[PDB]
């Protein structure tokens, strides 16, 4: 067993290098490795591996007082030296962390003693503590497990301070975690967690029905949503649906014809019946999104005007811009050119395909010819990084990334958002203001800058917001209520109490 559970994940957890990305899975890195400060649902951080901290008047020098009772799972001590060596290991690979502005802000990290850790920054970077709280990269592996005094070229054993220890991994089969019996904090009620590798959502549903697994936990792609709805009525099962955690949208390429035209992007934003899309493809399980960030997101309650479903207005906008229908044709033309837009998505993702088909149908109704380009994952991500798309499915990152970290990353040219925004005359101003907002401690100016950035992105119709999506749970009733974590990408296994 009653203190052992079996769940599933589409892939293995990876080698659990705390400082690297794909194929490491963030929820699993968070099971084993811990931060200096821990993120809370109210947006603050609490003391964690660091007991307390102070900062200089200019806000550029921070000194953390560390706990002195923490051991890595292999018995070796956690101290300021171990922490400092981890920061070094991360920043020796600084280029790979460009998306995260703290990695560009840290100028020095040194252990002043066994318990005092000093971090110095380029500027007064306000999201400092929240980015220290992220699943990666600033969490701590035992320095003995460095390879050649680094982590960027690999690690030995994935030894953390966290409440879970990786027991064993079997590529394409399973991963097994066990409770850390020597954890500095509270002991998890669960003793053992087995992750079965099950890449297909239908197969995951079937695995639950047969009793092969005890728990499914994930976002809107966890299992088929019609099946989820059926499960929620099944008295043998338990299901949960969280409050929304992030946005799913479309990103429109402002630097590529015909989405380079504001009038076209505005029309597309009137063309989609989002409520119908959600009820049709998402089985009514998610919420309609009118803006890049939901009004509940910090700094994003701005009274931005929604573009409600209005095919008539969409047509009028296109007509006014010179996109008119030839005799006998349903696809508009201008200057000889047809109104043709390519929508790229992961071809094997049934949900994405379903939504893409609905979007194509809705846009054909207003005279736009959307071509569906379904491709493998690697090809879609390549398209995102180099801007080879007309429209592309995209999503925000949830707490604590939204909005500051998502906005920060809009400045990175190898990200979808930069590419989508590249055609805007105001793009340099936007990027300047993003840099400014991260470093201001004038709260009035900070809100003003967020308003200007988000309002320009909204008014320029860079995105086509679709849904605010939720976390979803399917479980054996004996496991009880399943909690959600403050960080959207983490799974609070240590909080489960049968």
Rounded to whole angstroms, the Cα distance separating 324 from 320 reads 9
Q: Which of 174, 183, 401, 493 binds ligand 9YH (CB under 6 A)?
A: 401
Residues β-bridged to residue 53: 64
Part of the chain binding ligand 9YH (CB under 6 A), chosen from 21-29, 124-132, 233-241, 422-430: 21-29
Closer residue to ligand 9YH (CB): 221 or 338? 221
Closer residue to ligand 9YH (CB): 218 or 423? 218
Q: Does 21 bind ligand 9YH (CB under 6 A)?
A: yes
Supply the DSSP string of 324-380, one letter for each residue. Answer: BPPTT-SS-EETTEE-EEEEEEETT-HHHHHHHHHHHHHHHTTT-EEEEEEE-HHHH
Q: Does 489 bind ligand 9YH (CB under 6 A)?
A: yes
CA angle 416, 418, 423 (to 5 degrees): 115
Min. distance of Cβ 324 from ligand 9YH in angstroms? 39
Structure token digits, residue 430? 């936007």
Minimal CB distance residue for ligand 9YH: 397
Q: Does 349 bind ligand 9YH (CB under 6 A)?
A: no
239 contacts 471 by C-beta, under 8 angstroms: no
Structure token digits, residue 5? 């559970």
Min. distance of Cβ 385 from ligand 9YH in angstroms? 9
Interaction mask 23-42, ligand 9YH, x per CB under 6 A: ---x----------------
Min. distance of Cβ 23 from ligand 9YH in angstroms? 9
Part of the chain binding ligand 9YH (CB under 6 A), chosen from 18-26, 76-84, 153-161, 472-480: 18-26
Closer residue to ligand 9YH (CB): 264 or 491? 491
Tokens 């047969």 found at:
210
Closer residue to ligand 9YH (CB): 180 or 489? 489
Q: Does 136 bind ligand 9YH (CB under 6 A)?
A: yes
Q: Does 99 bind ligand 9YH (CB under 6 A)?
A: yes
Supply the DSSP string of 211-229, one letter for each residue. Answer: TS-SEEEESTTSS-HHHHH
Q: Does 184 bind ligand 9YH (CB under 6 A)?
A: no
SS3 469: strand
Closer residue to ligand 9YH (CB): 29 or 269? 29
Which 412-441 positions form the footprint of ligand 9YH (CB under 6 A)?
A: 415
Q: Does 313 bind ligand 9YH (CB under 6 A)?
A: no
494 contacts 265 by C-beta, under 8 angstroms: no
Q: Which residues contact 269 (CB under 8 A, 6 or more apart)?
A: 307, 461, 464
Binding-site size, ligand 9YH (CB under 6 A):
10
487 contacts 135 by C-beta, under 8 angstroms: yes
Min. distance of Cβ 344 from ligand 9YH in angstroms? 16
Closer residue to ligand 9YH (CB): 269 or 408? 408
Min. distance of Cβ 9 from ligand 9YH in angstroms? 12
Supply the DSSP string of 171-185, one letter for each residue. Answer: TTTEEEEEE-TT-SS
**If phi over 0 gives left and psi between -120 and 50 gives alpha, with beta otherwise, what is residue 426?**
alpha
SS3 277: helix
Q: Which residues contact 308 (CB under 8 A, 6 or more apart)?
A: 270, 290
Q: Which of 55, 88, 96, 340 binds ligand 9YH (CB under 6 A)?
A: 96
Q: Indicate the pairing of strand 164-170 with strand 174-179.
A: antiparallel
Q: Does 128 bind ligand 9YH (CB under 6 A)?
A: no
- Binding site residues, ligand 9YH, CB under 6 A: 21-22, 26, 96, 99, 136, 397, 401, 415, 489
């Amino acid at each position: 067993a009653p203190d052992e559970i079996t769940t599933a994940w589409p892939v293995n957890v990876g080698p659990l290098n705390p400082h690297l990305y794909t194929p490491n899975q963030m929820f699993a890195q968070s099971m084993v490795y811990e931060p200096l400060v821990k993120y809370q649902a109210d947006g603050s951080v609490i003391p964690w591996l660091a007991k307390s901290w102070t900062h200089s008047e200019d806000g550029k020098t921070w000194t953390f007082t560390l706990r002195d009772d923490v051991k890595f799972s292999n018995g070796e001590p956690f101290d300021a030296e171990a922490a400092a060596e981890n920061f070094r290991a991360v920043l020796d690979n600084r280029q790979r962390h460009a998306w995260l502005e703290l990695a560009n802000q840290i100028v020095d990290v040194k252990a002043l003693s066994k318990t005092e850790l000093q971090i110095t920054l380029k500027s007064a970077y306000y999201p400092f503590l929240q980015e220290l709280a992220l699943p990666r990269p600033f969490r701590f592996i035992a320095p003995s497990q460095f390879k050649n005094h680094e982590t960027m070229n690999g690690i030995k054993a994935p030894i953390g301070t966290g409440p879970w220890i990786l027991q064993e991994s079997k590529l394409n089969q399973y991963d097994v975690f066990v409770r850390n019996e020597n954890y500095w904090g509270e002991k998890p009620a669960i003793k053992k967690i087995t992750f079965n590798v099950i890449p297909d959502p239908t197969t995951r549903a079937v695995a639950f029905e047969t009793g092969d697994i005890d728990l499914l936990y994930g976002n809107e792609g966890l299992l088929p949503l019609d099946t989820f709805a059926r499960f929620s009525q099944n008295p043998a099962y338990h299901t949960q649906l969280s409050q929304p955690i992030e946005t799913v949208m479309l990103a429109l390429n402002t630097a590529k014809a015909p989405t380079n035209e504001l009038a076209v992007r505005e029309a597309l934003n009137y063309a989609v019946n989002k409520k119908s899309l959600i009820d049709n493809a998402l089985y009514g399980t998610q919420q309609v999104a009118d803006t890049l960030f939901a009004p509940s997101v910090p700094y994003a309650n701005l009274g931005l005007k929604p573009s409600q479903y209005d095919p008539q207005k969409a047509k009028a906008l296109l007509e006014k811009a010179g996109w008119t229908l030839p005799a006998g044709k349903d696809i508009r033309e201008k200057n000889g050119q047809p109104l043709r837009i390519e929508l790229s998505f992961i071809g094997t993702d049934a949900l994405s395909k379903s939504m893409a088909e609905i979007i194509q149908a809705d846009m054909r109704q207003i005279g736009a010819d959307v071509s569906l380009i379904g491709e493998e994952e690697s090809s879609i991500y390549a398209r995102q990084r180099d801007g080879r798309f007309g429209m592309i499915f995209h999503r925000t990152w949830g707490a604590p990334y939204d909005p500051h970290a998502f906005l920060s990353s809009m400045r990175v040219p190898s990200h979808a958002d930069f590419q989508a925004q590249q055609g805007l005359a105001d793009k340099p101003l936007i990027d300047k203001e993003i840099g400014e907002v991260l470093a201001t401690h004038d709260e009035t100016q900070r809100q003003a800058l967020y308003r200007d950035i988000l309002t320009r992105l909204h008014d320029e119709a860079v995105y086509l917001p679709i849904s605010y999506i939720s976390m979803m749970v399917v479980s054996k009733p004996e496991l009880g209520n399943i909690p959600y974590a403050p960080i959207a990408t983490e799974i609070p296994f240590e909080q489960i109490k049968p």
